[PDB]
Design an enzyme around this catalytic site. Structure first.
Site, PDB file in Angstrom:
ATOM      1  N   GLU A 151     -33.390  64.064 -27.145  1.00 50.65           N
ATOM      2  CA  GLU A 151     -32.103  64.249 -26.445  1.00 50.65           C
ATOM      3  C   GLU A 151     -30.956  63.801 -27.279  1.00 50.65           C
ATOM      4  O   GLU A 151     -31.012  62.670 -27.824  1.00 50.65           O
ATOM      5  CB  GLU A 151     -32.063  63.565 -25.094  1.00 50.65           C
ATOM      6  CG  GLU A 151     -30.835  63.821 -24.305  1.00 50.65           C
ATOM      7  CD  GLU A 151     -30.698  63.087 -23.008  1.00 50.65           C
ATOM      8  OE1 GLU A 151     -31.624  62.370 -22.604  1.00 50.65           O
ATOM      9  OE2 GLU A 151     -29.663  63.265 -22.340  1.00 50.65           O
TER      10      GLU A 151
ATOM     11  N   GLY B 165     -31.465  52.843 -25.114  1.00 50.58           N
ATOM     12  CA  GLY B 165     -32.364  51.912 -24.494  1.00 50.58           C
ATOM     13  C   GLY B 165     -33.732  52.430 -24.152  1.00 50.58           C
ATOM     14  O   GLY B 165     -34.734  51.728 -24.193  1.00 50.58           O
ATOM     15  N   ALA B 166     -33.790  53.701 -23.773  1.00 52.17           N
ATOM     16  CA  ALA B 166     -34.996  54.374 -23.279  1.00 52.17           C
ATOM     17  C   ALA B 166     -34.733  55.855 -23.111  1.00 52.17           C
ATOM     18  O   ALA B 166     -33.581  56.351 -23.203  1.00 52.17           O
ATOM     19  CB  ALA B 166     -35.474  53.724 -21.985  1.00 52.17           C
ATOM     20  N   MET B 167     -35.813  56.587 -22.890  1.00 56.29           N
ATOM     21  CA  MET B 167     -35.776  58.073 -22.753  1.00 56.29           C
ATOM     22  C   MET B 167     -36.799  58.620 -21.798  1.00 56.29           C
ATOM     23  O   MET B 167     -37.971  58.260 -21.852  1.00 56.29           O
ATOM     24  CB  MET B 167     -35.928  58.647 -24.153  1.00 56.29           C
ATOM     25  CG  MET B 167     -35.959  60.160 -24.170  1.00 56.29           C
ATOM     26  SD  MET B 167     -34.210  60.854 -23.585  1.00 56.29           S
ATOM     27  CE  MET B 167     -34.750  62.365 -22.643  1.00 56.29           C
ATOM     28  N   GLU B 168     -36.350  59.476 -20.886  1.00 55.81           N
ATOM     29  CA  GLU B 168     -37.113  59.960 -19.719  1.00 55.81           C
ATOM     30  C   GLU B 168     -38.011  61.132 -19.989  1.00 55.81           C
ATOM     31  O   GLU B 168     -38.250  61.942 -19.063  1.00 55.81           O
ATOM     32  CB  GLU B 168     -36.141  60.283 -18.566  1.00 55.81           C
ATOM     33  CG  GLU B 168     -35.233  61.530 -18.809  1.00 55.81           C
ATOM     34  CD  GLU B 168     -33.867  61.267 -19.367  1.00 55.81           C
ATOM     35  OE1 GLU B 168     -33.684  60.218 -20.065  1.00 55.81           O
ATOM     36  OE2 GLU B 168     -33.012  62.187 -19.197  1.00 55.81           O
ATOM     37  N   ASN B 169     -38.556  61.258 -21.200  1.00 51.93           N
ATOM     38  CA  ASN B 169     -39.323  62.438 -21.519  1.00 51.93           C
ATOM     39  C   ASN B 169     -40.469  62.616 -20.497  1.00 51.93           C
ATOM     40  O   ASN B 169     -41.144  61.640 -20.125  1.00 51.93           O
ATOM     41  CB  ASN B 169     -40.001  62.332 -22.856  1.00 51.93           C
ATOM     42  CG  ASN B 169     -39.139  61.809 -23.931  1.00 51.93           C
ATOM     43  OD1 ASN B 169     -39.390  60.618 -24.415  1.00 51.93           O
ATOM     44  ND2 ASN B 169     -38.185  62.557 -24.344  1.00 51.93           N
TER      45      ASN B 169
ATOM     46  N   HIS C  10     -34.492  53.264 -13.978  1.00 54.02           N
ATOM     47  CA  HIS C  10     -33.690  54.381 -14.485  1.00 54.02           C
ATOM     48  C   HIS C  10     -34.524  55.518 -15.013  1.00 54.02           C
ATOM     49  O   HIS C  10     -34.376  56.695 -14.587  1.00 54.02           O
ATOM     50  CB  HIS C  10     -32.707  53.876 -15.522  1.00 54.02           C
ATOM     51  CG  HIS C  10     -31.729  54.915 -16.022  1.00 54.02           C
ATOM     52  ND1 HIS C  10     -30.453  54.947 -15.543  1.00 54.02           N
ATOM     53  CD2 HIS C  10     -31.818  55.891 -16.945  1.00 54.02           C
ATOM     54  CE1 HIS C  10     -29.801  55.939 -16.122  1.00 54.02           C
ATOM     55  NE2 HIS C  10     -30.599  56.483 -17.023  1.00 54.02           N
ATOM     56  N   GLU C  11     -35.435  55.251 -15.948  1.00 51.39           N
ATOM     57  CA  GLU C  11     -36.180  56.329 -16.598  1.00 51.39           C
ATOM     58  C   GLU C  11     -37.125  57.004 -15.577  1.00 51.39           C
ATOM     59  O   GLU C  11     -37.258  58.241 -15.576  1.00 51.39           O
ATOM     60  CB  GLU C  11     -36.956  55.833 -17.803  1.00 51.39           C
ATOM     61  CG  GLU C  11     -36.083  55.203 -18.881  1.00 51.39           C
ATOM     62  CD  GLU C  11     -34.855  55.966 -19.240  1.00 51.39           C
ATOM     63  OE1 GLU C  11     -34.802  57.201 -19.299  1.00 51.39           O
ATOM     64  OE2 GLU C  11     -33.908  55.302 -19.539  1.00 51.39           O
TER      65      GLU C  11
ATOM     66  N   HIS D 286     -35.163  59.397 -13.328  1.00 53.98           N
ATOM     67  CA  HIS D 286     -34.862  60.650 -13.981  1.00 53.98           C
ATOM     68  C   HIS D 286     -35.933  61.686 -13.717  1.00 53.98           C
ATOM     69  O   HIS D 286     -35.677  62.891 -13.868  1.00 53.98           O
ATOM     70  CB  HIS D 286     -34.766  60.464 -15.510  1.00 53.98           C
ATOM     71  CG  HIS D 286     -33.405  60.181 -16.039  1.00 53.98           C
ATOM     72  ND1 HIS D 286     -32.278  60.871 -15.644  1.00 53.98           N
ATOM     73  CD2 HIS D 286     -32.999  59.290 -16.968  1.00 53.98           C
ATOM     74  CE1 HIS D 286     -31.241  60.441 -16.315  1.00 53.98           C
ATOM     75  NE2 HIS D 286     -31.659  59.526 -17.179  1.00 53.98           N
TER      76      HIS D 286
HETATM   77  N1  LIG Z   1     -28.348  51.856 -16.077  1.00 56.72           N
HETATM   78  C1  LIG Z   1     -29.679  51.253 -16.412  1.00 56.72           C
HETATM   79  C2  LIG Z   1     -29.725  51.292 -17.906  1.00 56.72           C
HETATM   80  C3  LIG Z   1     -29.210  50.242 -18.679  1.00 56.72           C
HETATM   81  C4  LIG Z   1     -29.267  50.317 -20.078  1.00 56.72           C
HETATM   82  C5  LIG Z   1     -29.839  51.457 -20.685  1.00 56.72           C
HETATM   83  C6  LIG Z   1     -30.323  52.505 -19.882  1.00 56.72           C
HETATM   84  C7  LIG Z   1     -30.974  53.750 -20.434  1.00 56.72           C
HETATM   85  C8  LIG Z   1     -30.009  54.744 -21.035  1.00 56.72           C
HETATM   86  C9  LIG Z   1     -30.929  55.756 -21.655  1.00 56.72           C
HETATM   87  P1  LIG Z   1     -30.981  57.355 -20.802  1.00 56.72           P
HETATM   88  O1  LIG Z   1     -31.990  57.551 -19.716  1.00 56.72           O
HETATM   89  O2  LIG Z   1     -29.658  57.598 -20.224  1.00 56.72           O
HETATM   90  C10 LIG Z   1     -31.299  58.655 -22.015  1.00 56.72           C
HETATM   91  N2  LIG Z   1     -31.266  59.973 -21.271  1.00 56.72           N
HETATM   92  C11 LIG Z   1     -30.310  58.547 -23.146  1.00 56.72           C
HETATM   93  C12 LIG Z   1     -30.627  59.587 -24.185  1.00 56.72           C
HETATM   94  C13 LIG Z   1     -30.716  59.206 -25.634  1.00 56.72           C
HETATM   95  C14 LIG Z   1     -29.837  59.817 -26.534  1.00 56.72           C
HETATM   96  C15 LIG Z   1     -29.974  59.495 -27.893  1.00 56.72           C
HETATM   97  C16 LIG Z   1     -30.956  58.579 -28.335  1.00 56.72           C
HETATM   98  C17 LIG Z   1     -31.834  57.987 -27.427  1.00 56.72           C
HETATM   99  C18 LIG Z   1     -31.708  58.335 -26.074  1.00 56.72           C
HETATM  100  C19 LIG Z   1     -29.151  54.054 -22.073  1.00 56.72           C
HETATM  101  O3  LIG Z   1     -29.643  53.757 -23.194  1.00 56.72           O
HETATM  102  O4  LIG Z   1     -27.962  53.775 -21.784  1.00 56.72           O
HETATM  103  C20 LIG Z   1     -30.277  52.426 -18.495  1.00 56.72           C
HETATM  104 ZN   LIG Z   2     -30.448  58.187 -18.295  1.00 54.15          ZN
END
Ligand SMILES: NCc1cccc(C[C@H](CP(=O)(O)[C@@H](N)CCc2ccccc2)C(=O)O)c1
Ligand SMILES: [Zn+2]
Ligand SMILES: NCc1cccc(C[C@H](CP(=O)(O)[C@@H](N)CCc2ccccc2)C(=O)O)c1
Length: 865
Positions: free
Chosen positions: A115, A255-259, A291-292, A295
């Site tokens: 993503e 932080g993380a990714m919802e694959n 969160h993940e 998603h």
């Molecule tokens: N609100 C709770 C919370 C606090 C801190 C971090 C997250 C996960 C979100 C990751 P995401 O689920 O939105 C993901 N879709 C971001 C996509 C991404 C783009 C580039 C590289 C890695 C991941 C993030 O990293 O801001 C959530």
């Molecule tokens: Zn997200």
């Protein structure tokens, strides 16, 4: 330079129905082969595939295609009129991929991040989220080096090859956009668990970590099970596969990714134990794991039509995580923490050169739009549907949203229409929350005449770089009334007699009549932070003390404290400016004493009431800012508070040590005493820096968990004693093997208010546990320095030059991190002329780099031009 515009959206000419992938992993190269089943939508158009990996071959129905490759686009004009296949072969060197987007190595293992547009770094594809396909993935690798081979979905086959290799095949039966593809290959340990859905189906849960890290994953597993159960109970939503995988990775840009079925997490949001992680870190795991998982419905089952709609998934999922966390524990304190985050980090965004709507109308690089506005303002926008509709009505909207749009890639407009349509109301004006940038400013005045409290409210929204015209918005203002002893006063509004109401402002100016008011009142306004706006209402300092002491709403009491601190800092700026003695702050000190002494307040809430707004909040709205003057004034406030109440800070520390009661593990109840204790430690060490040697003597005894170690180290971090440096060195030695604790060390190095921080930071660059190429390390050291007011904004410009040099260096291998860092310069236009001149020089130097990324270029352009 290419700009992408939301008004230019067109449906794809081609769909991809089936995506078959084969990964042959070797040293050093991975060969990827695809077979794509392609269905014309606009027959006769050229087939255009995105891609940046080395291309080895391309076939259309088995025959070498007649194609051209230019830039990152592959075009085939000669395509059949009916369904056809495309086969592409690419070659990737994952250990050369330091961008951490696409297929890359980390810790000797292989991971992906797709993503938004990383999949095109793996193969040539129609890499946009409105193209949904059914994926099957075959992976072949050396069994000893890569015993664990994962991709989305269900494992349907696998076996052994007689040269030391093995293979697996994964089928993900839900058609999905390419951004949700994942693959992992590695020597990883597994932690297994399970959840049983409310329909009675078991879901196998598997967390993959390094062998050494496995003992730290148990809280994340528990959090996932809690999140699965909550989405069933609160939203009626069940998981849809019998397998849910989470993989921890230490090199990750976010932080993380919802694959789908195979989430990939930064270690910081999956690993904890009380020896090495703070309470806040546990809270974070719980939030992000939730969160993940959330998603899976809000993003995966219903996805985004295009990347302009990012907030469709992210605002809504952030709201979902916030609600989960709130329902777990400590809702009011957690809500204030969220509001504080929004105001500290998103309000400055909306006031600065990179301001954008929740749904941007254009972008150059989409990675520059994973912002506080899209996420945190996005979630506020979602939360407003809830404030307007109530929980039941909000759930009616959700229900229609999925009924209409399960399996589709949709827009923010579709979400709004489902809320509107399910509840039979008109939310047309609400659309402006997606299209108008900027923080709305409400000016209000009130008057008790007769028995009516007449509240007049005006709204305005400032021009932002993208748009000048801002029309009135739909703004819910939650209100109550306090009498002279601060109890609730009832009133009449739209037929109902109550102590609270939501006043819905839809016009540029409106008057609201709260009737039947039998006593003298002070209004309580924007309760629960009911809209993400600036509200100005004329309050006396006594009115603020009353609100703080007596209002029933958490936000409005906290807001009263915040206002008293802002006024105190303004008073210090005026004395320091006139070269006179600091103010007495008698009324503020009286209010704080009441807070310290009130034993009915929640302790985490008390801790928040004793927090002073940041320098950025304080200089919001100012021009010609000298950041060090604001820092000087804020530090003088904290010093006054530290010294004035020194004995009481020690006493509250002691009470908190007693009430924690040796319960060092994470829990929400123990955590709030600890939060309070850490506020007291900070104030004690401000007033009495020599107490650091007493700290040192008894450190081992105090160091009962990382919340305490971090709390102590944070409190002494600005101390000029040599002991401070010794405690930090001891910390680094004690935890040298734990990369997440080493992130904390570097953050202390970078954040110190000591005079020598810049050279300590430069030394830290060369610490054996620092890696510039690791985003967590770079954010902790360099990122912290960039936010360290006295140092980043040093008059000599040494802070600006250092950060500029690191934007330039980082951008060579990870533009995402570099483009986040370069935003430290966002205040440029608003700085006093000497600093402004130096900031502009730094930004011109960045611009003058050959081969500067599009990511950093877009940001620099916004600030400079
Ligand atoms: N609100 C709770 C919370 C606090 C801190 C971090 C997250 C996960 C979100 C990751 P995401 O689920 O939105 C993901 N879709 C971001 C996509 C991404 C783009 C580039 C590289 C890695 C991941 C993030 O990293 O801001 C959530
Ligand atoms: Zn997200
Ligand atoms: N729009 C609905 C839709 C469209 C296309 C594909 C799916 C995948 C799903 C996956 P599966 O074949 O692996 C199924 N057997 C999983 C059943 C299950 C097991 C455990 C927990 C929850 C659900 C299924 O058909 O139920 C769904």
């Amino acid at each position: 330079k290419t700009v992408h515009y939301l008004k230019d959206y067109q449906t794809p000419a081609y769909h991809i129905l089936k995506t078959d992938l084969h990964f042959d992993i070797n040293e050093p190269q991975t060969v990827v082969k695809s077979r794509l089943t392609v269905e014309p939508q606009r027959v006769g158009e050229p087939l255009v595939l995105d891609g940046s990996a080395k291309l080895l071959s391309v076939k259309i129905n088995g025959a070498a295609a007649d194609y051209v490759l230019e830039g990152e686009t592959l075009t085939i004009a000669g395509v059949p009129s009916e369904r056809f296949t495309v086969e592409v072969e690419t070659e990737i060197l994952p250990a050369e991929n330091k961008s951490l987007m696409g297929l890359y190595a980390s810790g000797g293992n292989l991971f992906t991040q797709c993503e938004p547009e990383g999949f095109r770094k793996i193969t040539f594809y129609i890499d946009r989220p409105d193209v949904m396909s059914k994926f099957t993935t075959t992976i072949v690798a050396d069994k000893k080096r890569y015993p664990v081979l994962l991709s989305n979905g269900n494992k349907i086959d696998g076996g052994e090859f007689s040269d030391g290799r093995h293979w697996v095949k994964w089928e993900d039966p839900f058609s999905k956009p390419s951004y949700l593809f994942a693959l992992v290959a590695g020597d990883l340990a597994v932690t297994e668990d399970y959840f049983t859905t409310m329909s009675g189906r078991n879901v196998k849960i598997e967390f993959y970590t390094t062998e050494a890290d496995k003992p730290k994953v148990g809280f994340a597993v528990e959090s996932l099970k809690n999140a699965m159960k909550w989405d069933e109970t609160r939203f009626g939503l069940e998981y849809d596969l019998d397998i849910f995988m989470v993989v921890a990775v230490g090199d990750f840009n976010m932080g993380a990714m919802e694959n789908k079925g195979l989430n990939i997490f930064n270690t910081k949001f999956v690993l904890a134990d009380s020896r090495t992680a703070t309470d806040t870190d546990f809270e974070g795991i719980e939030s992000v794991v939730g969160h993940e998982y959330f998603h899976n419905w809000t993003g995966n089952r219903v996805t985004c039509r295009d990347w302009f709609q990012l907030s469709l998934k992210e605002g809504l999922t952030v709201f979902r995580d916030q609600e989960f966390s709130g329902d777990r524990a400590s809702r009011a304190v957690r809500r204030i923490e969220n509001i504080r985050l929004l105001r500290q980090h998103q309000f400055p965004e909306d006031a600065g050169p990179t301001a954008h709507p929740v749904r941007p109308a254009s972008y150059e690089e989409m990675n520059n739009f994973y912002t506080m506005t899209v996420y945190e303002k996005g979630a506020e926008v979602v939360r407003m549907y809830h404030t307007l509709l109530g929980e039941e009505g909000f759930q009616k909207g959700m229900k229609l949203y999925f009924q209409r749009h399960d399996g589709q890639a949709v827009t923010c407009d579709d979400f709004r229409a489902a809320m509107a349509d399910a509840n039979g109301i008109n939310l047309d004006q609400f659309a402006l929350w997606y299209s108008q940038a900027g923080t709305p400013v409400l000016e209000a005045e009130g008057r008790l005449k007769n028995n009516i409290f007449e509240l007049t409210v005006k709204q305005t929204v400032p021009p932002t770089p993208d748009m000048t015209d801002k029309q009135p918005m739909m703004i819910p203002v939650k209100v109550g009334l306090l009498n002279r002893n601060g109890e609730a006063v009832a009133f009449d509004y739209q037929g109902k007699r109550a102590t609270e109401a939501v006043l819905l402002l839809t016009e540029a100016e409106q008057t609201f009549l709260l009737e039947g008011v039998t006593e003298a009142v002070v209004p309580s306004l924007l309760r629960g932070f009911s809209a993400p706006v600036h509200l100005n209402y004329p309050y006396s300092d006594d009115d603020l003390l009353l609100l703080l002491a007596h209002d029933s709403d958490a936000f409005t009491r906290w807001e009263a404290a915040q206002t008293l601190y802002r006024r105190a800092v303004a008073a210090n700026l005026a004395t320091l400016s006139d070269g006179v003695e600091l103010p007495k702050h008698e009324k503020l000190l009286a209010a704080v004493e009441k807070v310290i002494s009130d034993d009915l307040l929640d302790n985490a809430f008390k801790a928040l009431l004793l927090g002073v707004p940041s320098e950025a909040e304080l200089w919001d709205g100012a021009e010609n800012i000298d950041p060090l003057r604001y820092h000087q004034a804020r530090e003088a406030l904290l010093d006054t508070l530290a010294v004035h109440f020194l004995p009481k800070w020690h006493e509250l520390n002691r009470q908190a040590a007693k009430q924690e009661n040796q319960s060092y593990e994470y829990s929400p109840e123990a955590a709030g005493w600890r939060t309070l204790r850490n506020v007291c430690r900070a104030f004690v060490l401000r007033a009495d820096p020599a107490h650091i040697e007493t700290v040192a003597e008894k450190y081992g005894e105090m160091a009962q968990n990382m919340t305490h170690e971090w709390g102590i180290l944070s409190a002494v971090n600005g101390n000029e004693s040599d002991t401070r440096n010794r405690l930090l060195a001891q910390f680094a030695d004690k935890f040298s093997d734990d990369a997440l604790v080493m992130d904390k060390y570097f953050a202390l190095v970078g954040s110190s208010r000591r005079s020598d921080t810049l050279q300590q930071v430069r030394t830290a660059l060369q610490h054996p546990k620092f890696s510039l190429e690791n985003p967590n390390k770079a954010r902790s050291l360099i990122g912290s320095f960039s936010r360290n007011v006295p140092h980043f904004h040093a008059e000599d410009g040494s802070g600006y030059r250092f950060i500029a040099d690191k934007v330039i260096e980082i951008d060579r291998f990870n533009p995402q991190v570099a483009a986040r860092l370069v935003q430290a310069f966002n205040l440029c236009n608003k700085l006093e002329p000497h600093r402004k001149n130096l900031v502009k020089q730094a930004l011109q130097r960045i611009r003058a780099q050959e081969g500067l990324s599009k990511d950093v270029g877009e940001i620099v352009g916004k600030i400079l031009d």
